């Protein structure tokens, strides 16, 4: 789930995601785990340190996926398809971490503890802009796309569904991602329209 | 700008949008306008009442636009194009209200004062689902689209750009919306790909 310490991190993540980081105290977490605060402090020095481990594990997992996808695909279309679907994998299997990132990363990024957030932000943009540029150059994508805008569109659409997606529901995040991807690639209009 | 009272509402909206509703006091607003709190209370009974007037004026303006668009377009493709662009008109010219809605509407909606929020939420969904259904039936849109999912995609993409769009920048919201719309309609892949 989180991309004894691991069990505690899982519980803390769920609580952070549901209630918000700042609204969650160490006492809250310790009580949730049915343990004393002193015992929780045998695993983590602070709630800030907990979020740090959560976001690091999440981003390390995600950018490892990106790497594997980039390495294993044969052209920019295959690559973009794989990279696009990775966010929905994250939504399905690392939901708490995704929600925590969405809700807290921008605020946290100004603290030295979380300097890696902007590092990864830069790395992800370069990744997307590179695949878009290569896809336009080789003729997989429309030639007059505004690459920065399409990057924005993709960044928006790969993660925006976490705001409404329900984990226990009928549609899986994968199915949502496949349909979202279909629109990104081919739009909603019929050929000839 | 806001879709003497009007000037004060403008100032309050900007402050609400920038700092958040709950973080903004009446004293803050009155000080911003260079007036006593008692004088501000000659226009509004509470900050809750201010937000109510802001969100009502905004939704009334927006759904009037929707109405005009529905009435003046000849087919579901034209209709969807017009309706889609209306959010970017809102982002450009009613930015504070859009941000306030995005950041506060879900929380406020449970209060009786704001019961119209869910009413409009239902009305907007029905609008989108109706144009999508009619477009599929008449052959403007792909036949096997999951209408509820495409509604979600459109709702997500029509408003998500307000999270990063900069009002003073080079691209206008209209240009962002036109490119977003182009992808929604025809995707990023070249014909044949």
UniProtKB/Swiss-Prot annotation, chains A, B:
Residue ranges of DNA binding: 25-44
Keyword NAD included in the entry's annotation: no
Keywords on record: DNA-binding, Repressor, Transcription, Transcription regulation
GO biological process: one example: regulation of DNA-templated transcription
Transcription is among the record's keywords: yes
Cystine bridges: none
Gene3D superfamilies: Homeodomain-like, Tetracycline Repressor, domain 2
GO molecular function list: DNA binding; DNA-binding transcription factor activity; transcription cis-regulatory region binding
HTH tetR-type domain residues: 4-62
SUPFAM superfamilies on file: Homeodomain-like, Tetracyclin repressor-like, C-terminal domain
Domain of life: Bacteria
Assembly behavior: Homodimer.
Task performed by this protein: Controls the expression of a small regulon that may play a role in the utilization of cholesterol.
Stated name of the protein: HTH-type transcriptional repressor KstR2
Originating species: Mycobacterium tuberculosis (strain ATCC 25618 / H37Rv)
């Amino acid at each position: 789930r989180v991309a004894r310490r691991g069990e505690l991190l899982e519980l803390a993540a769920a609580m952070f995601a549901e209630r918000g980081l700042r609204a969650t105290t160490v006492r809250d977490i310790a009580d949730g785990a049915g343990i004393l605060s002193g015992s929780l402090y045998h695993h983590f020095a602070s709630k800030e340190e907990m979020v740090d481990e959560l976001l690091r594990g999440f981003l390390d997992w995600l950018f490892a996926r990106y790497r594997d996808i980039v390495d294993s695909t044969a052209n920019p279309l295959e690559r973009l398809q794989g990279l696009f679907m990775a966010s929905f994998e994250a939504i399905e299997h690392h939901h708490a971490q995704v929600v925590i990132y969405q809700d807290e990363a921008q605020r946290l990024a100004s603290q030295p503890r979380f300097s890696y957030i902007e590092d990864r932000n830069k790395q992800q943009r370069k990744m997307w802009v590179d695949v878009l540029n290569q896809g336009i150059e080789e003729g997989y994508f429309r030639p007059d796309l505004d690459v920065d805008l399409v990057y924005r569109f993709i960044r928006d659409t790969t993660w925006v569904s976490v705001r409404w997606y329900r984990p226990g529901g009928p549609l899986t995040a994968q199915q949502v991602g496949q349909q979202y991807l279909a629109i990104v690639l081919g739009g909603i209009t019929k050929e000839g329209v």
